[PDB]
Structures are given as structure tokens and as C-alpha cells.
Design a protein around this ligand. Structure first.
Ligand SMILES: OC[C@H]1O[C@@H](O[C@H]2[C@H](O)[C@@H](O)[C@H](O[C@H]3[C@H](O)[C@@H](O)[C@H](O[C@H]4[C@H](O)[C@@H](O)[C@H](O)O[C@@H]4CO)O[C@@H]3CO)O[C@@H]2CO)[C@H](O)[C@@H](O)[C@@H]1O
Length: 587
């Protein structure tokens, strides 16, 4: 056909991006409707709405209600966001016929996004058995993958898993249908030479299988920080047990921790008496509580998915001060920028006084204080398409309050630019720059009565240069890196006992005469973090991680070991990076 030669002439111009214009000047003579539909599809692939509707009018001027044009109109209306117009256009579709599986799949998808699940289910129940009998190809693989996704969204995960297992035969991942979970996970592994459809099938099948599994983890981590014995010589142990069970689209988790806080003993020298900046010992010598240690247990329950997450729990029961923490989060995408808002209630685990609170010596006052809880909101912005760049930012503001402590509030701001030197599937090395600015209304770093004993700089500014190295193989997954930082702090002079209602009347004048001097300091800091994970058998995984914090921010170091149990059995690609259990207080 003469028109066929014209069409292929334009098809030999797709190398240049201006082939649409060339078709436009070529079709200045009456083009009938076949080339019009071809250029309408071309316009649909590149940009939408405006010219798509222009071509809609051009075809509809002299068309006998073509099914493809109307279907494209439905798709455009769904993209535009007009439910009524899209539904009307879908109803305008002609009666069902042979309708080669592609157009049926598009109509079923449009019905799925148009609130017609009661008809989309029937459409896909008719589409899948016929596609199964066909030999392996692209369209059959696409329709099988879309049916598996629809069944996953429908509610039944078993049918989606079966469809995903079958889809590999049509796509070309495997010649024979898998009959066991181990082969399924092994075929979900990534390959450096795969088509887009094959990559998508592997990714979504692996994600669905990981979501639909039972995991049990046990982790014990040793954390602490050097300091003066009695209130700051922190040496703490925590044991956490977590079980992740699938539920609807997301995963439900149950976490239970067991802490053991040991801060040492007072270095008494004045004949069984000590006079340190803790409690009210500087007004009168303290005696009786030479050893300071505590332990407790906590329970956490929550549910999360891709869109929004929430959790609820309590602070470790057994401590001097106990409170009910909580949190919630939401995530979405705006263009190329992703934002994750959240409102959280978290305690401070930097010290025993901040976390569970201490008790003053029975000789002087014998009163309980501490237990700082931060209730605030935060806004985080992320942007990453993942070729040679990455930028993230975050801002949060809390209201630091606690039992028998002075009220305080903070406004933190974190930002960072990370550059991926290697962007391989199994290897990722990132070098970038980090910036952090914090501001606290009141300096409560002292451990005296009325203060929270937590790092609260009035003005903070830190610049860090982190270097990362993420790599994985068949059985090993490790991460090694370091980050040197330069920080500048500036505190202000505050009275030693901001809240004067607890101190005795006799010591009131001397208490007022005592104040905590403020100062400014700057210096270089560094931090080193390493991770390791090894898959021993198909069900049990073991790993460990070491965190070293020397950034002058009084952050304690962390050394953790954990073992993960998988009920189903995962023989697929390892986690990049390995994912240890973050402590509940650190959330
Ligand atoms: O065929 C009609 C059918 O089309 C559907 O839309 C399809 C497009 O037809 C199809 O060209 C497109 O495939 C893209 C794919 O989106 C890209 O991801 C891919 O680029 C890959 C690359 O192949 C990989 O090697 C590499 O690793 O990653 C990049 C991407 O990161 O390139 C191909 C071709 O350009 O996918 C669309 C979605 O299916 C319509 O949805 C449907 O209505 C029509 O019936």
C-alpha cells in the first residue's frame, strides 16, 4: 500500500525526536484514519492531554467511533482526573468481540481505575486463562503481570502469587513453571541483561513475596558512652524481639524490648559523701544511693505500608518514669519530589535521666525527676531518580517536656547532598556532604534537679562529609564507611535549678546563687559505621553491625548482633543495605 510505505517512512525517523512534526507535514493531504491513529498513539506516548485531545477532535471529525481512539480518550481522562467523562467514554466502547488481548487489558485496567472492580474482576478472569494457553510472548507476559497486580490489589495474595509464578513462562525468565518457593525466589533475582518487563516482573514478584511472609528476629545490642561515674558512665544492654506478619497491603509488626541501664557508681571521696553536679548534692552532701542502675521492658505494636505508617507503644516499664509514646506518618509524591510528613512522640535515650529519670538522694530531697518526652511534627523532602545525583532535606520541631523538668522546645534542620560514584545493582558507593542546624530554647545539659540532662545547644552547626560503600553477593551483604564532621556549638548561661518549687526553702538562696556557666567550642569529629549480613540456610539469617559515634554530639556508640528467621524461605537478592532492628527509643 502507498500509505503503508508512508507510515514506515516516518517509522525510519524515530531516531530524531521531531518525527511527529514530519508526520504532521506529511499528512497535510487527507490521511483517512489509520495514520491519524498512529500519530495519536505517538502523541499518547510523549506528553498528554492537550495534543491528545487535539488528535481526538481530528479523528472524531471523520471517524465511525473507533474503539482505539475512544480507549485512548478514557486513558487521557483518567490521567486528567475526570471520573464521569472517563466512565462515559468507557461506556461509549462498542460491544465486546474478538478484541485481541491488548485492548481488553487496557479496558479492564481503565475499569479498575474507574471504580469498576466488579466488572474488572470478570474481565481479568476471562483474560487470564486464554493468555495462559498462548505461547510465551510480550503481550501475554504483560497481561499476566497486570492480572497478578490486580489480584494483589483485589485482596487475595495466593492467586497473585500463582499468576506471578506463571508469568515467568510467558516472559522468558524460565522455560518451566516453578513448583517450589526456593526456585521462585531464586528466579526473582536481578540480572544485568533483562528487558523492562522482565525486570518489573522480578521486582514486583520479589516485593510481593517478601511482603507475604512471616519473620521473627532477636537482637541484643551493647550501647553506652564514657562519662563521670554515677550519672554519665553509661553502659546499657537492650534485647528486642520483633515478629512481622502480613496484613492487607502492608506488614504488621509487634516489637518488645528489654533494656538494662547501668551508669556506674558515684566516686565518693569526702568520707562517704560526694558533691557532684547531680540532683541537689552541691547544696548538701548526698549518701545512700551509691549505685545507680535500672532495667525494664517495653512493648510496641504498629502497622505500615507504602503510603502511610503508624505505631503505638510505651516507654520501658520498670523505670522511674513511664510514658506512652506514639507516632504516625504519611508519604506521597509531588512531581520529582517526595515528601514524608509525620507526627511523633519519642523519648530521649542519650542518658538514663532523660530516658527513665533518676531519683535524688534520700538524704537531701529524695524526689523523682526526668523522663523527657518530645512531642512534635516534622517535614521531610526527598528527591532521587537514581543515576548520578541525590538530594534530601528534613525539618522538625519538638516540645521537650518531662516530669519535674523545665519546659523546652527545639527546631532542628537537616539537609544533605549525596553523589553516587557507582550506581550498579549490586554495588553502590556514595560520597557527599551533610549539614545540620539545631536550636534549643534552654540549655538543660546539666544533671542537677530540674534539668533533663540532655545535649541542648542554643546554636549548633555541623558540616559532615560521609563516604558510603554498599555491596552484596550471593550470600554476603556488607556496608563500610566513615564520615568526618566539623561542628560548632554555643550554649548560654542558665541557673542550675530552673524550677525552684522543689528545692527546700533553707537552700533557696544558695540554690539561686548557683548557675551553670555557658560556653562555646568547636572541633572536628568523625563517625564509623559497619554492617554485615550472611544467609546461612534458606530460613535463618545472621548479621551484625557496629556504630562508632565521635562527632562531639554526645551520641553513644552501638554494637549489635541479630538473627532473622524467615518462615517461607528467601533465596533471592540480599538487602541493600542490610536492615538491623533500630531501637524503639531511636525511632
Ligand atoms: O504496546 C501497547 C501497550 O503499551 C503500554 O505502554 C508501554 C509501552 O508500550 C512500552 O514501550 C514501555 O516500555 C518502556 C519501558 O517503560 C521502559 O522502562 C524501558 O526502559 C528500561 C529499559 O528497557 C531497561 O533496559 C533499563 O534497565 O531500564 C529502563 C527504564 O528504567 O523502555 C521501554 C520501551 O521504551 O512500557 C509501557 C508500559 O507498559 C501501554 O500501557 C498499553 O496501554 C499499551 O496497550
Amino acid at each position: 500500500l502507498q500509505s503503508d510505505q508512508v507510515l514506515e517512512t516516518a517509522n525510519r525517523l524515530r531516531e530524531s525526536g521531531k518525527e511527529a512534526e514530519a508526520e504532521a507535514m506529511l499528512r497535510q493531504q487527507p490521511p483517512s484514519t489509520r495514520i491519524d491513529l498512529t500519530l495519536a498513539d505517538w502523541a499518547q506516548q510523549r506528553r498528554d492531554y492537550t495534543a491528545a485531545r487535539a488528535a481526538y477532535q481530528n479523528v472524531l471529525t471523520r471517524e465511525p467511533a473507533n474503539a482505539d481512539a475512544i480507549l485512548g480518550l478514557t486513558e487521557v481522562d483518567i490521567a486528567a482526573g475526570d471520573k464521569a467523562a472517563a466512565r462515559s467514554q468507557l461506556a461509549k466502547l462498542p460491544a465486546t468481540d474478538n478484541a485481541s488481548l491488548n485492548t481488553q487489558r487496557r479496558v479492564a485496567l481503565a475499569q479498575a481505575q474507574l471504580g469498576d472492580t466488579a466488572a474488572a474482576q470478570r474481565t481479568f478472569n476471562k483474560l487470564i486463562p486464554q493468555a495462559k494457553s498462548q505461547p510465551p510472548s510480550m503481550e501475554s507476559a504483560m497481561v499476566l503481570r497486570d492480572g497478578a497486580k490486580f489480584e494483589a490489589q483485589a485482596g487475595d495474595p495466593t492467586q497473585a502469587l500463582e499468576t506471578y509464578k506463571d508469568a515467568m513462562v510467558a516472559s522468558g525468565v524460565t522455560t518451566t513453571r516453578p513448583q517450589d518457593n526456593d526456585t521462585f525466589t531464586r528466579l526473582t533475582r536481578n540480572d544485568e541483561k533483562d528487558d523492562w518487563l522482565k525486570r518489573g516482573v522480578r521486582s514486583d514478584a520479589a516485593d510481593l513475596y517478601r511482603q507475604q511472609d512471616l519473620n521473627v528476629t532477636l537482637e541484643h545490642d551493647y550501647w553506652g558512652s564514657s562519662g563521670t561515674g554515677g550519672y554519665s558512665d553509661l553502659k546499657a544492654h537492650t534485647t528486642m524481639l520483633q515478629v512481622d506478619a502480613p496484613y492487607s497491603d502492608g506488614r504488621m509488626f509487634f516489637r518488645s524490648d528489654f533494656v538494662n541501664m547501668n551508669v556506674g557508681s558515684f566516686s565518693t571521696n569526702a568520707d562517704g559523701k560526694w558533691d557532684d553536679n547531680w540532683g541537689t548534692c552541691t547544696l548538701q552532701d548526698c549518701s545512700g544511693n551509691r549505685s545507680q542502675s535500672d532495667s525494664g521492658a517495653s512493648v510496641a505494636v504498629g502497622w505500615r505500608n507504602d503510603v502511610w505508617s503508624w505505631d503505638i507503644g510505651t516507654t520501658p516499664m520498670g523505670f522511674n518514669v513511664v510514658d506512652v509514646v506514639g507516632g504516625i506518618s504519611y508519604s506521597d509524591d509531588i512531581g520529582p519530589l517526595g515528601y514524608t510528613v509525620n507526627a511523633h512522640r519519642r523519648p530521649i535515650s542519650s542518658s538514663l535521666l532523660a530516658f527513665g529519670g533518676q531519683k535524688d538522694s534520700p538524704s537531701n530531697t529524695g524526689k523523682k525527676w526526668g523522663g523527657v518526652r518530645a512531642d512534635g511534627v516534622g517535614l521531610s523532602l526527598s528527591y532521587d531518580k537514581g543515576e548520578a545525583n541525590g538530594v534530601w532535606a528534613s525539618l522538625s520541631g519538638d516540645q521537650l517536656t518531662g516530669k519535674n523538668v523545665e519546659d523546652n522546645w527545639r527546631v532542628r534542620w537537616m539537609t544533605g547532598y549525596y553523589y553516587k560514584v557507582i550506581n550498579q545493582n549490586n554495588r553502590r558507593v556514595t560520597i557527599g556532604l551533610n549539614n545540620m542546624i539545631w536550636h534549643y530554647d534552654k540549655d538543660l545539659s546539666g544533671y542537677s534537679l530540674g534539668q533533663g540532662g540532655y545535649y541542648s545547644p542554643q546554636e549548633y552547626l555541623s558540616f559532615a562529609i560521609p563516604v558510603m560503600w554498599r555491596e552484596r553477593t550471593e550470600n554476603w551483604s556488607w556496608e563500610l564507611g566513615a564520615s568526618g564532621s566539623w561542628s560548632h556549638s554555643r550554649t548560654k548561661t542558665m541557673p542550675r535549678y530552673p524550677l525552684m518549687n522543689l528545692i527546700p526553702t533553707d537552700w533557696q538562696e544558695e540554690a539561686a546563687r548557683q548557675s551553670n556557666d555557658g560556653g562555646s567550642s568547636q572541633g572536628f569529629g568523625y563517625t564509623a559505621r559497619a554492617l554485615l549480613e550472611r544467609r546461612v540456610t534458606s530460613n535463618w539469617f545472621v548479621g551484625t553491625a557496629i556504630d562508632i559515634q565521635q562527632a562531639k554530639d554526645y551520641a553513644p556508640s552501638h554494637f549489635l548482633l541479630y538473627v532473622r528467621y524467615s518462615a517461607a524461605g528467601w533465596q533471592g537478592d540480599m538487602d541493600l543495605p542490610p536492615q538491623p532492628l533500630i531501637p524503639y527509643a531511636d525511632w
